[PDB]
């Protein structure tokens, strides 16, 4: 009930998100994910 | 084994030359293919340079 006596009140950080640019490591991650290994990793 | 011993300095002559060339060309480039290729080459060259220095130190 006494919370409205503060002089440092702000609603929320409702600001636009920062903008980012594409990098090259995600393509490398996909390439490494698309290749074959030595173990089996599964059995049905 | 006569001339075989003296090529170590010869290889060291271009080791850091090519590593600097790769660093500069990786910095300058803009494509995604070239960047990945140059990064892989840089890692390979670091590994090979260690390897050759380790064997050179061990043999002598």
JSON list of C-alpha atoms in Angstrom, two decimals:
[
{"chain": "A", "resi": 1, "resn": "UNK", "atom": "CA", "xyz": [0.00, 0.00, 0.00]},
{"chain": "A", "resi": 2, "resn": "UNK", "atom": "CA", "xyz": [3.04, 2.23, 0.58]},
{"chain": "A", "resi": 3, "resn": "UNK", "atom": "CA", "xyz": [4.65, 1.30, -2.76]},
{"chain": "A", "resi": 4, "resn": "UNK", "atom": "CA", "xyz": [3.36, 4.44, -4.53]},
{"chain": "A", "resi": 5, "resn": "UNK", "atom": "CA", "xyz": [5.55, 6.84, -2.52]},
{"chain": "A", "resi": 6, "resn": "UNK", "atom": "CA", "xyz": [8.70, 5.95, -4.49]},
{"chain": "A", "resi": 7, "resn": "UNK", "atom": "CA", "xyz": [10.13, 8.52, -6.92]},
{"chain": "A", "resi": 8, "resn": "UNK", "atom": "CA", "xyz": [12.17, 6.02, -8.97]},
{"chain": "A", "resi": 9, "resn": "UNK", "atom": "CA", "xyz": [9.36, 4.08, -10.64]},
{"chain": "A", "resi": 10, "resn": "UNK", "atom": "CA", "xyz": [9.64, 2.64, -14.16]},
{"chain": "A", "resi": 11, "resn": "UNK", "atom": "CA", "xyz": [7.13, 0.45, -16.00]},
{"chain": "A", "resi": 12, "resn": "UNK", "atom": "CA", "xyz": [9.34, -2.11, -17.76]},
{"chain": "A", "resi": 13, "resn": "UNK", "atom": "CA", "xyz": [12.14, -2.47, -20.31]},
{"chain": "A", "resi": 14, "resn": "UNK", "atom": "CA", "xyz": [9.64, -2.55, -23.18]},
{"chain": "A", "resi": 15, "resn": "UNK", "atom": "CA", "xyz": [12.22, -1.57, -25.79]},
{"chain": "A", "resi": 16, "resn": "UNK", "atom": "CA", "xyz": [12.84, -2.85, -29.30]},
{"chain": "A", "resi": 17, "resn": "UNK", "atom": "CA", "xyz": [15.24, -5.82, -29.39]},
{"chain": "A", "resi": 18, "resn": "UNK", "atom": "CA", "xyz": [18.75, -5.27, -30.71]},
{"chain": "A", "resi": 19, "resn": "UNK", "atom": "CA", "xyz": [19.47, -6.09, -34.35]},
{"chain": "A", "resi": 20, "resn": "UNK", "atom": "CA", "xyz": [22.16, -8.59, -35.32]},
{"chain": "A", "resi": 21, "resn": "UNK", "atom": "CA", "xyz": [23.83, -9.66, -38.56]},
{"chain": "A", "resi": 22, "resn": "UNK", "atom": "CA", "xyz": [24.42, -13.14, -39.95]},
{"chain": "A", "resi": 23, "resn": "UNK", "atom": "CA", "xyz": [27.71, -14.92, -39.22]},
{"chain": "A", "resi": 24, "resn": "UNK", "atom": "CA", "xyz": [29.46, -17.87, -40.85]},
{"chain": "A", "resi": 25, "resn": "UNK", "atom": "CA", "xyz": [29.74, -20.35, -37.96]},
{"chain": "A", "resi": 26, "resn": "UNK", "atom": "CA", "xyz": [26.16, -21.65, -38.25]},
{"chain": "A", "resi": 27, "resn": "UNK", "atom": "CA", "xyz": [26.91, -23.02, -41.73]},
{"chain": "A", "resi": 28, "resn": "UNK", "atom": "CA", "xyz": [29.97, -24.78, -40.31]},
{"chain": "A", "resi": 29, "resn": "UNK", "atom": "CA", "xyz": [27.80, -26.20, -37.52]},
{"chain": "A", "resi": 30, "resn": "UNK", "atom": "CA", "xyz": [25.30, -27.57, -40.05]},
{"chain": "A", "resi": 31, "resn": "UNK", "atom": "CA", "xyz": [28.10, -29.02, -42.20]},
{"chain": "A", "resi": 32, "resn": "UNK", "atom": "CA", "xyz": [29.61, -30.78, -39.18]},
{"chain": "A", "resi": 33, "resn": "UNK", "atom": "CA", "xyz": [26.15, -32.01, -38.16]},
{"chain": "A", "resi": 34, "resn": "UNK", "atom": "CA", "xyz": [25.51, -33.50, -41.62]},
{"chain": "A", "resi": 35, "resn": "UNK", "atom": "CA", "xyz": [28.55, -35.84, -41.60]},
{"chain": "A", "resi": 36, "resn": "UNK", "atom": "CA", "xyz": [29.05, -39.44, -40.45]},
{"chain": "A", "resi": 37, "resn": "UNK", "atom": "CA", "xyz": [30.66, -40.91, -37.34]},
{"chain": "A", "resi": 38, "resn": "UNK", "atom": "CA", "xyz": [32.14, -44.21, -36.09]},
{"chain": "A", "resi": 39, "resn": "UNK", "atom": "CA", "xyz": [29.73, -45.36, -33.35]},
{"chain": "A", "resi": 40, "resn": "UNK", "atom": "CA", "xyz": [26.13, -46.57, -33.64]},
{"chain": "A", "resi": 41, "resn": "UNK", "atom": "CA", "xyz": [24.29, -44.24, -31.23]},
{"chain": "A", "resi": 42, "resn": "UNK", "atom": "CA", "xyz": [20.99, -46.13, -31.63]},
{"chain": "A", "resi": 43, "resn": "UNK", "atom": "CA", "xyz": [19.47, -49.63, -31.56]},
{"chain": "A", "resi": 44, "resn": "UNK", "atom": "CA", "xyz": [15.85, -50.65, -32.11]},
{"chain": "B", "resi": 1, "resn": "UNK", "atom": "CA", "xyz": [71.24, -36.42, -44.93]},
{"chain": "B", "resi": 2, "resn": "UNK", "atom": "CA", "xyz": [73.69, -33.76, -46.17]},
{"chain": "B", "resi": 3, "resn": "UNK", "atom": "CA", "xyz": [71.35, -31.10, -47.52]},
{"chain": "B", "resi": 4, "resn": "UNK", "atom": "CA", "xyz": [68.49, -32.58, -45.47]},
{"chain": "B", "resi": 5, "resn": "UNK", "atom": "CA", "xyz": [69.50, -30.72, -42.30]},
{"chain": "B", "resi": 6, "resn": "UNK", "atom": "CA", "xyz": [69.48, -27.18, -43.74]},
{"chain": "B", "resi": 7, "resn": "UNK", "atom": "CA", "xyz": [65.89, -27.01, -45.01]},
{"chain": "B", "resi": 8, "resn": "UNK", "atom": "CA", "xyz": [64.52, -26.36, -41.50]},
{"chain": "B", "resi": 9, "resn": "UNK", "atom": "CA", "xyz": [65.40, -22.68, -41.75]},
{"chain": "B", "resi": 10, "resn": "UNK", "atom": "CA", "xyz": [64.08, -22.68, -45.30]},
{"chain": "B", "resi": 11, "resn": "UNK", "atom": "CA", "xyz": [60.67, -23.91, -44.10]},
{"chain": "B", "resi": 12, "resn": "UNK", "atom": "CA", "xyz": [60.72, -21.43, -41.21]},
{"chain": "B", "resi": 13, "resn": "UNK", "atom": "CA", "xyz": [61.30, -18.73, -43.84]},
{"chain": "B", "resi": 14, "resn": "UNK", "atom": "CA", "xyz": [57.81, -19.13, -45.29]},
{"chain": "B", "resi": 15, "resn": "UNK", "atom": "CA", "xyz": [55.98, -20.45, -42.19]},
{"chain": "B", "resi": 16, "resn": "UNK", "atom": "CA", "xyz": [55.10, -17.07, -40.69]},
{"chain": "B", "resi": 17, "resn": "UNK", "atom": "CA", "xyz": [54.97, -15.50, -44.16]},
{"chain": "B", "resi": 18, "resn": "UNK", "atom": "CA", "xyz": [52.07, -17.73, -45.17]},
{"chain": "B", "resi": 19, "resn": "UNK", "atom": "CA", "xyz": [50.45, -17.50, -41.73]},
{"chain": "B", "resi": 20, "resn": "UNK", "atom": "CA", "xyz": [50.44, -13.69, -42.02]},
{"chain": "B", "resi": 21, "resn": "UNK", "atom": "CA", "xyz": [49.12, -13.90, -45.58]},
{"chain": "B", "resi": 22, "resn": "UNK", "atom": "CA", "xyz": [46.28, -16.15, -44.40]},
{"chain": "B", "resi": 23, "resn": "UNK", "atom": "CA", "xyz": [45.51, -13.82, -41.49]},
{"chain": "B", "resi": 24, "resn": "UNK", "atom": "CA", "xyz": [45.32, -10.78, -43.77]},
{"chain": "B", "resi": 25, "resn": "UNK", "atom": "CA", "xyz": [43.24, -12.52, -46.44]},
{"chain": "B", "resi": 26, "resn": "UNK", "atom": "CA", "xyz": [40.84, -13.88, -43.81]},
{"chain": "B", "resi": 27, "resn": "UNK", "atom": "CA", "xyz": [40.49, -10.36, -42.41]},
{"chain": "B", "resi": 28, "resn": "UNK", "atom": "CA", "xyz": [39.82, -8.84, -45.84]},
{"chain": "B", "resi": 29, "resn": "UNK", "atom": "CA", "xyz": [37.41, -11.42, -47.27]},
{"chain": "B", "resi": 30, "resn": "UNK", "atom": "CA", "xyz": [33.61, -11.18, -47.17]},
{"chain": "B", "resi": 31, "resn": "UNK", "atom": "CA", "xyz": [32.23, -14.55, -48.37]},
{"chain": "B", "resi": 32, "resn": "UNK", "atom": "CA", "xyz": [31.30, -17.46, -46.09]},
{"chain": "B", "resi": 33, "resn": "UNK", "atom": "CA", "xyz": [33.10, -20.18, -48.06]},
{"chain": "B", "resi": 34, "resn": "UNK", "atom": "CA", "xyz": [36.43, -18.34, -47.99]},
{"chain": "B", "resi": 35, "resn": "UNK", "atom": "CA", "xyz": [36.19, -17.52, -44.28]},
{"chain": "B", "resi": 36, "resn": "UNK", "atom": "CA", "xyz": [35.62, -21.14, -43.26]},
{"chain": "B", "resi": 37, "resn": "UNK", "atom": "CA", "xyz": [38.36, -22.38, -45.59]},
{"chain": "B", "resi": 38, "resn": "UNK", "atom": "CA", "xyz": [40.85, -19.85, -44.22]},
{"chain": "B", "resi": 39, "resn": "UNK", "atom": "CA", "xyz": [39.98, -20.63, -40.59]},
{"chain": "B", "resi": 40, "resn": "UNK", "atom": "CA", "xyz": [40.46, -24.36, -41.19]},
{"chain": "B", "resi": 41, "resn": "UNK", "atom": "CA", "xyz": [43.76, -23.67, -42.95]},
{"chain": "B", "resi": 42, "resn": "UNK", "atom": "CA", "xyz": [44.93, -21.50, -40.04]},
{"chain": "B", "resi": 43, "resn": "UNK", "atom": "CA", "xyz": [44.17, -24.23, -37.49]},
{"chain": "B", "resi": 44, "resn": "UNK", "atom": "CA", "xyz": [45.88, -26.84, -39.67]},
{"chain": "B", "resi": 45, "resn": "UNK", "atom": "CA", "xyz": [48.97, -24.66, -40.01]},
{"chain": "B", "resi": 46, "resn": "UNK", "atom": "CA", "xyz": [49.20, -24.06, -36.26]},
{"chain": "B", "resi": 47, "resn": "UNK", "atom": "CA", "xyz": [49.02, -27.82, -35.70]},
{"chain": "B", "resi": 48, "resn": "UNK", "atom": "CA", "xyz": [51.63, -28.60, -38.37]},
{"chain": "B", "resi": 49, "resn": "UNK", "atom": "CA", "xyz": [54.01, -25.90, -37.12]},
{"chain": "B", "resi": 50, "resn": "UNK", "atom": "CA", "xyz": [53.86, -27.27, -33.55]},
{"chain": "B", "resi": 51, "resn": "UNK", "atom": "CA", "xyz": [54.32, -30.77, -34.83]},
{"chain": "B", "resi": 52, "resn": "UNK", "atom": "CA", "xyz": [57.41, -29.94, -36.90]},
{"chain": "B", "resi": 53, "resn": "UNK", "atom": "CA", "xyz": [58.96, -27.90, -34.08]},
{"chain": "B", "resi": 54, "resn": "UNK", "atom": "CA", "xyz": [58.35, -30.73, -31.60]},
{"chain": "B", "resi": 55, "resn": "UNK", "atom": "CA", "xyz": [60.02, -33.32, -33.83]},
{"chain": "B", "resi": 56, "resn": "UNK", "atom": "CA", "xyz": [62.88, -30.94, -34.67]},
{"chain": "B", "resi": 57, "resn": "UNK", "atom": "CA", "xyz": [63.56, -30.37, -30.96]},
{"chain": "B", "resi": 58, "resn": "UNK", "atom": "CA", "xyz": [63.29, -34.08, -30.14]},
{"chain": "B", "resi": 59, "resn": "UNK", "atom": "CA", "xyz": [65.60, -35.29, -32.91]},
{"chain": "B", "resi": 60, "resn": "UNK", "atom": "CA", "xyz": [68.48, -32.89, -32.20]}
]
